[PDB]
Amino acid sequence: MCLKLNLLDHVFANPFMNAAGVLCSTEEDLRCMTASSSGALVSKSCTSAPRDGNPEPRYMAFPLGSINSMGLPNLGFDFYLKYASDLHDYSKKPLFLSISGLSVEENVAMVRRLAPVAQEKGVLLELNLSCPNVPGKPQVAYDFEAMRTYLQQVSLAYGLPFGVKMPPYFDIAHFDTAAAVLNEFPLVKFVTCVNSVGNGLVIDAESESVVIKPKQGFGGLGGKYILPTALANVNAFYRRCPDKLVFGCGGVYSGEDAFLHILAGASMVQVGTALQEEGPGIFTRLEDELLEIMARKGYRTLEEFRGRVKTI
Amino acid sequence: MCLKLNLLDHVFANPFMNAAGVLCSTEEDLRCMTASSSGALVSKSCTSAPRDGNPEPRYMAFPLGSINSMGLPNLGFDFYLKYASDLHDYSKKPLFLSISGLSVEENVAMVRRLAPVAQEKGVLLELNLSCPNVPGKPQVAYDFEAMRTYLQQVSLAYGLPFGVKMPPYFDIAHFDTAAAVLNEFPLVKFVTCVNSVGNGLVIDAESESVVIKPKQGFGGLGGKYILPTALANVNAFYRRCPDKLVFGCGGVYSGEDAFLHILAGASMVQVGTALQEEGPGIFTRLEDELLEIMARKGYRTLEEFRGRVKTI
Numbered sequence A, B: 001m002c003l004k005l006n007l008l009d010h011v012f013a014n015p016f017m018n019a020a021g022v023l024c025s026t027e028e029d030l031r032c033m034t035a036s037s038s039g040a041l042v043s044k045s046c047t048s049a050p051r052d053g054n055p056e057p058r059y060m061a062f063p064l065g066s067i068n069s070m071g072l073p074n075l076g077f078d079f080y081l082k083y084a085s086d087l088h089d090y091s092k093k094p095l096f097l098s099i100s101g102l103s104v105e106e107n108v109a110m111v112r113r114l115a116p117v118a119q120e121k122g123v124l125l126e127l128n129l130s131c132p133n134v135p136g137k138p139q140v141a142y143d144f145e146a147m148r149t150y151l152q153q154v155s156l157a158y159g160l161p162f163g164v165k166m167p168p169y170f171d172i173a174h175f176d177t178a179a180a181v182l183n184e185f186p187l188v189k190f191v192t193c194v195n196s197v198g199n200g201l202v203i204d205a206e207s208e209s210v211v212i213k214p215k216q217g218f219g220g221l222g223g224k225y226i227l228p229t230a231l232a233n234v235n236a237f238y239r240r241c242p243d244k245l246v247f248g249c250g251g252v253y254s255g256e257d258a259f260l261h262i263l264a265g266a267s268m269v270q271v272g273t274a275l276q277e278e279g280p281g282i283f284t285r286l287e288d289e290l291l292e293i294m295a296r297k298g299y300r301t302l303e304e305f306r307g308r309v310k311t312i
């Protein structure tokens, strides 16, 4: 038994990949993710120009997860586009390129240049509408009119299939509205739930200090803290977007956690905090563990249980 | 060294109290909370008429916290008002009465009747604008226009100092907007941050099932999961509402957790999931553990470190 699957006109050896931003900023990082046993990789969310990002320290990890305010440090769109167009070995695994412009105009500029490379190479766009860490730039997908504008302008400029990285929601009315907006756009073929839980605050009792420097210590949460939130969002969008794929991200540390994401409706399963902490070896462990749970339960395929979470 | 506080024209032996909804629905519960070593108690959020609440199972706890969709089961406003009027021993500790009407009209009806008892007995109103569990009723405070309407109508009808139980926010823009709305209302003397993190989803891997019955398994999260979110909200409103008090709620299991809430700006510290799990003996443990930390750090009173979290 193997975990191989086909989605979006691509073949994947297994449903696992890095979460955007983790192990994917440099050529070295991307080569490492490519050499791993992950089913795919996604690049660091990029901007038109290179960015140094927010002041350090800007990432910290703890037993229950992580906090980060990286601030989109990246080598610039020119680099990630070149990686996609010239450097990536597509025979190894599919590539997603994540973009996170600070305005609709910036995103439109990037997708116009990404289009010919998508046509030639089959690189897949993930549009990031949920960065919670750039000072003075609120999460785009928490403003539904802004979200509609971005998706309208990107659909028109790009003209090819793409996906969206969504922030977590916490209100049924918000699930209803956000999914309704997404469903207006046939080019949106996948929905990644979720980005980090925005603007949490970790304080160290001994030093009586916040643990990251940017934004007075406020940063996005990942890891064990966020698993039930992530599962909720995966399932909410799975239920509301029956003609799209949902990719799960948030709180994955084991094959069991991946199993839950898939039960909730996840097609791909992304790994952020756990990958940052454990390194790319995690992918062999996650595949082994997921296969073990499937064997124990008598499942032969992911399709057999994807989205089949039972209600009471 | 002491944990004493004087606020809202009342005296509190220590900052600890139950979180609304935990150990406070029946006369038995309220008597139990009164007999405990807590500095205060709050009653179950009530509605005009008694409510059975949502179908069971509707609460489940795990190592990292809890999920609930109780659905505001309560004995009705008449009961809680009578408890406050006739039954509560104010010589033991102060009492807060939480109300969670399903409309502004319902809330107004209740506060009109509460006002004479508040004037007579000194019972303190907590207005719940953040219940995430009644099907078809999104959190009031996620709609800032609705929030303003509720606070306008309740201020006018009540005419006495009161507090508001707030949902968690995840966006700096939302902290800014929510605090600005609150600051329009001089009668709002305290802000309790936070209610449960709404509409999470816990799935059991063995049974492949959600663990609570209402709303297809979607329920509010409390406990370990939510501490950094709770601290963020406490500090955000502490910074933005310099003329109000902030009460902390979320993820408190230890004196250390309480210490962090207080560093973030909390006056009172409420205990939900940990109290539900451990029972009212938790209050003597929290007192001992907070005093232990204070002793080690040379702090003699709460005011010496309240709101004194350091940034980098």
Ligand SMILES: Cc1cc2nc3c(=O)[nH]c(=O)nc-3n(C[C@H](O)[C@H](O)[C@H](O)COP(=O)(O)O)c2cc1C
Pocket (backbone or CB within 6 Å): A019, A020, A021, A022, A044, A045, A046, A059, A066, A068, A070, A072, A098, A128, A165, A194, A195, A196, A221, A222, A223, A224, A226, A249, A250, A251, A252, A270, A271, A272, A273, A274, A276
């Ligand atoms: C160091 C760090 C950097 C991240 N950078 C990005 C980013 O560039 N783009 C993005 O969409 N998400 C980014 N994320 C969010 C993750 O992709 C993921 O959505 C989140 O961490 C939750 O998953 P987890 O619980 O596995 O960490 C980043 C997270 C962290 C830990």
Ligand SMILES: Cc1cc2nc3c(=O)[nH]c(=O)nc-3n(C[C@H](O)[C@H](O)[C@H](O)COP(=O)(O)O)c2cc1C
Pocket (backbone or CB within 6 Å): B019, B020, B021, B022, B044, B045, B059, B066, B068, B070, B072, B098, B128, B165, B194, B195, B196, B221, B222, B223, B224, B226, B249, B250, B251, B252, B270, B271, B272, B273, B274, B276
């Ligand atoms: C069983 C249950 C019932 C609750 N009922 C109420 C309620 O009636 N009114 C309210 O404002 N919050 C209610 N809450 C939310 C808690 O007051 C608290 O805000 C939340 O559980 C987070 O705190 P914790 O992390 O200590 O659990 C309830 C929580 C649970 C666990």
Ligand SMILES: O=C(O)c1cc(=O)[nH]c(=O)[nH]1
Pocket (backbone or CB within 6 Å): A021, A045, A068, A069, A070, A071, A072, A073, A100, A128, A130, A131, A132, A133, A134, A195, A196, A220
């Ligand atoms: O670069 C970052 O700060 C970052 C971006 C993003 O989308 N999500 C996140 O958690 N961090």
Ligand SMILES: O=C(O)c1cc(=O)[nH]c(=O)[nH]1
Pocket (backbone or CB within 6 Å): B021, B045, B068, B069, B070, B071, B072, B073, B128, B130, B131, B132, B133, B134, B195, B196, B220
């Ligand atoms: O009764 C409930 O379901 C309830 C109310 C509330 O305000 N918060 C919560 O977590 N549960």
